[PDB]
């Protein structure tokens, strides 16, 4: 005598409910909202939780996207102060962090982070036994480090967002300059995310063509070099503009996501454990060419680096062990 | 003597450049940039032109958006503060507006869009002769008969957001109570946008059943009516929590801009000119479910309402003629 | 020493190979290629396993498929005639059968297919446990009954293609009669799949409205009806013109993975177990409304048939009963 | 008084029935049939119509289609034996040939081709005076020449399949060699299509690591050279199982169609108009890395080739203008 008893009946037999597919968002700032409508739009999970500590923030951010259900194709989309929402999640990526002080040490920046990750992370894990983590959080090779070490996790389940969107800010450059869509440009930007990127300008190429082969050459003078500069730069040109950054991110993050999930060893310049790779000795992450499929990190593409190259990779790897004298201030 | 030149060559023929799918949007405040993130997520153009009077704000949610270009399948974006960038556009999806203040009366808030509204609109007709137009701007009713009456276009190629989300809204709430997906249920909240949305109880079903026939009915007392209330309701819910609507709204704007672009003949409870109508005589929009082509609003879905929901319907038509007292003050 | 070896390196840690959303297709004729094409292109699993009897058939339809890997998201195709090879499965789509000759009965005809089926299914479930089933085969609401005993499952892991198609096609022609995309219209064809299909009059509409309401009504005398038997008729065109069918019936069978691997609750006309339902009181399948999520089907929409409607419903379930006198002859 | 009447009204403005993203596929055979559903599946175009001479199959592959339109998004699909049924087309791809028979000279087989395509081709630019025509039909760069010919379009919007699907089996090869998908390795099979194929060893890489460099090299012997035999080969032993080819083929073609329809400026391997590049002097027709818009072909990637390689690009060249001794017998 109910509508739902007079409209809705029943076979014999039936199943406890299920969430296969699940992903776990942390942060609902810009960074995840823009992550978790990618992921949404893209149709990688039959499940989206979302964390945050701000309560209010996570409930109306978690009914905007309940309202175009209609609009998508994911099921149950949830959030949680609580951990306990993100109990079985095959994937979870962390957009939660601190953004760094009038007068902030990198040191003490990431201290700060370690301290919130502290909370963050543990927790994840025991939720989530099986999932693989994935930190967009700045500084990302310094707080996947973290994340790591927090967790517990096989070194192969904790990824970086690392250099994937600075590689897919590079092929955009390129692909303005030659007159090709960004996808049929190819070019690597590793190492140590940020000012101390390596282009490797000796794998640019447009259909197996080598740019520096054609050019002359070019690493050392006449501008072309400049397509690094604004690779960096022209990330800060946006924050100075629109006063922050979410969109690419998001998207970067989506497509990372897709590789993961549709188990596809897709091969991305993501942040890994590059311990005893290029002469680096200690527990450092940095980007080199992964190979991703549904376990996390399954291989690494061996670049064949000059000199020049790899010293600056080691010379990030000093740099960032220095941090690690981490747990407190 | 160039790398461009060394490494691209030429065809003897060859034809200027083009852009066929071309979609423009106006504003880049929190639906502006929900509303062009999903249509380049669906791949609905091949041409998305961004425009605001805010510089920054504007070059920088244009970088944000090129440097995901690797990630979608859309070949140009821009922005322009001009409104030549929207030259050529097949849809234009407006969501800039003024948004009511400390003693403001509808009147007077109805009365600042049709200042911004004047300088809007009448430069996106001129650069895009064959254009449709979508109206999201709240007061939405309103603001489509001052768009509608601003540019000049026959009254098929304007759009008003309507009543989509509110029925998107409706149908995930129902969903929620049964137990079945929000697309397999199916209810329509047509009419004036917002607190005087009528809900036509009498088409709720799934799968053909009427759930009116079933609950012994259901419109006067025993909590379902509440069904409407916080469709209406639980979107104030929303800003109280997030500090505004996006998301949801967004995805709505690109189910619209799909139908549209793919010319298909999809029902959709929009805006339009409801005039001799349901007794209506004056110069009044207002949502009623429609079908949409590439051309705009092709028909109309003549529903049979009850006198006491075309009276309603009625109520919000006097009202709205009331407003269109409008040119200053 | 090896080009493998000495581009791929390699993390300390890794974990065995990986598929989760597996989906099987038995039987590589032209529904099968049908179905197993448009699942692929729809991204539904990580894992498309194709088996049939015929080896050279079987392994070319493989190839055929794996060259197309770069335009695809499934990161694994195989085929075998070994059945382990579907090890794993979620879902299991079943379309081999005999055709129906020369002087063949319905008896005879159900019972070649039991001989079949004793061999294809028995195995799958081995092999594939957790695994739902969906029977495409003609007879279809025979040949679920059949998948279902010979089985052992849960009578909730086996479906029946039954009447979707059929609906699908009602639907196509109401649209082209009413002028709005056959995603606006809604009509249901239930019971027996094929020539004792039975077609709602009385839930048909478009946005909410009851066509029946508005025609002064239609089920008897004014050319409408005509609108079933060429649902049922041009079905047999189709044959007569091309030799056979696969095109609308394998999307229509990506329909129903999409629901079931994406975990919907999306309602579908297919064939279950209506045992009890509308007075029929043995183990006969039929379509009815039913509600889909990965552990199959979830729910019944309880229709309000006429008499009229539930007599014909019931003769098929006796009809069909009758023909269940199966092993051997 | 009709149902049609009492439940769909009208603005009182509307406009001419609409096709803008138009594509016709000629051919409903294996190839045809396989590339008519991938551009569906694909979402590419807002009208698709079939032409064939076969009355019967034509009409029943166009009905099979029509059926599935709830599963789809596009609008309207037609065919026809006439050719005004394809007026208006964004896109021709052509699919219609002879297959060369016991004691059939490549010229004979030509030939006869010449004398089908004079009554396919000529119809299509005056019923679509803007179309950019794509011809799979084999053997493809003399099929190619004769289509260029026979129409009078500008050299760039006359585009051949060549070694395309060569490149994405040679990519696939690769992939499974090497343990990563098959769109992070990257290979370029150029020149004329089929036996006499060139596999430019030294444009082979994974993340931009050329393997010539690491494997020592290779080229001339230790078994890799394989990988080029069987992905000519392997195509035969395809037929020698399934008793033709369709599906990569079809998946191939959307590949294509969406990269010109999307305007994107990717670059295919297809078959160009390669006059005076690589030394060759005539209207020979071969595969070279093109970047493709709406237009056609807007570019062409200057690959620096070795004479060895160049050497072998002109003996096709030959060859090919040599048979062009057409027009009987």
Request: charged share 20%.
């Amino acid at each position: 005598a109910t509508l739902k008893d007079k409209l809705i009946g029943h076979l014999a037999t039936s199943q406890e409910p299920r969430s296969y597919n699940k992903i776990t968002v942390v942060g609902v700032g810009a960074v995840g909202m823009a992550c978790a409508i990618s992921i949404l739009m893209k149709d990688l999970a039959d499940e989206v939780a979302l964390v945050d500590v701000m309560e209010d923030k996570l409930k109306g951010e978690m009914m905007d996207l309940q309202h175009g259900s209609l609009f998508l194709h994911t099921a149950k989309i949830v959030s949680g102060k609580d951990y306990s929402v993100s109990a079985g999640s095959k994937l979870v990526v962390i957009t939660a962090g601190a953004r760094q002080q009038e007068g902030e040490s990198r040191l003490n920046l990431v201290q700060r982070n370690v301290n919130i990750f502290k909370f963050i992370i543990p927790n994840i894990v025991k939720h989530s036994p099986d999932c693989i983590i994935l930190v967009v959080s700045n500084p990302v090779d310094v707080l996947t480090y973290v994340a790591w070490k927090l967790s517990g996790l096989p070194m192969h389940r904790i990824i970086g967002s690392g250099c994937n969107l600075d590689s897919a800010r590079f092929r955009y450059l390129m692909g303005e300059r030659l007159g090709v869509h960004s996808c049929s440009c190819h070019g690597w930007v590793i190492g140590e995310h940020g000012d101390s990127v390596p282009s490797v300008w000796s794998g640019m190429n447009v259909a197996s063509i080598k740019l520096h082969p054609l050019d002359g050459t070019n690493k050392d003078k006449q501008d072309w070099k400049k397509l690094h500069k604004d690779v960096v730069d022209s990330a800060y040109e946006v924050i100075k503009l629109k006063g922050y950054t979410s969109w690419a991110i998001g998207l970067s993050v989506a497509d990372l996501a897709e590789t993961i999930m549709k188990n596809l060893c897709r091969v991305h310049p993501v942040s890994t454990m590059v311990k005893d790779f290029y002469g680096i000795k200690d527990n450092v992450f940095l980007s080199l060419p992964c190979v991703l499929n549904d376990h996390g990190i399954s291989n690494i593409v061996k670049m064949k680096l000059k000199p020049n190259e790899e010293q600056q990779l080691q010379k990030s790897a000093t740099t960032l062990w220095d941090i690690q004298k981490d747990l407190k201030f």
